[PDB]
Amino acid sequence: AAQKSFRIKQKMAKAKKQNRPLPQWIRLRTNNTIRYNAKRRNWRRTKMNI
Amino acid sequence: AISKNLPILKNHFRKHWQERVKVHFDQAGKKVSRRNARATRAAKIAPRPLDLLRPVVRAPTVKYNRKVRAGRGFTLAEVKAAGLTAAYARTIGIAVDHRRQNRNQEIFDANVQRLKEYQSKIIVFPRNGKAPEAEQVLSAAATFPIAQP
């Protein structure tokens, strides 16, 4: 909003850290059910409603 | 909603009885727990008989006054007639009822005789010293069964 509360700007930060793909060495871990970042979020697809 | 020669079945289930149904699957389980409770109480208070001594009293009403049954406790008049004090009787394992009154001689005679044969059949350890090794009996009522006159 170009003028945002700081508690909003913390919502900003973890949005950016979480918006990254699953690390590729997770595959190599034993009995790994995890296949992809299911909680992946994009601004183009869905909104984060803060 | 009614037809044929069928009796009028008064079933009281218009309410939501389903949330309030209690099915006793634990009947076997509670019996084992109760027997365990009897076992642990006896082990706790050994060698006292795990239960009190109840007087033999006549049942009320015209229907049951033909049967005697184990009442609550010995009336104070019966305790003194046995030569005791109410407080002492409670400690040595005699159930005492203060609100019951003795108005029948035959019942009174049985109870004071019940107390007299209870005293002569129990032994009491002294407070101080080496208590004699006694074997715990588990049913005072069985040892002094209620008798039909």
């Binding site: 508690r7 909003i8 409603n49 803060i50 | -």
Partner: protein
Amino acid sequence: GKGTPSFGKRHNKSHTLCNRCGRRSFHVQKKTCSSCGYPAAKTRSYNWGAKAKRRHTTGTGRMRYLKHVSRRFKNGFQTGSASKASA
């Protein structure tokens, strides 16, 4: 147009973040959260909300402290420390 032309005018914020429940359910004009009942001391929860209780009940999150109390009681809330040095 009560639909798509009107949807364009949806650019305000009825609700914002609630400091207690962290949901985007804190009504601004009412100055109260619609989920946890902020700022009222009692955490807004109803029996008719059978699922909503399940979402925000004990056990939902971290259990910072209540998690260990089961172990603490089990050992007896005992204090002090152990003695034996090592193998």
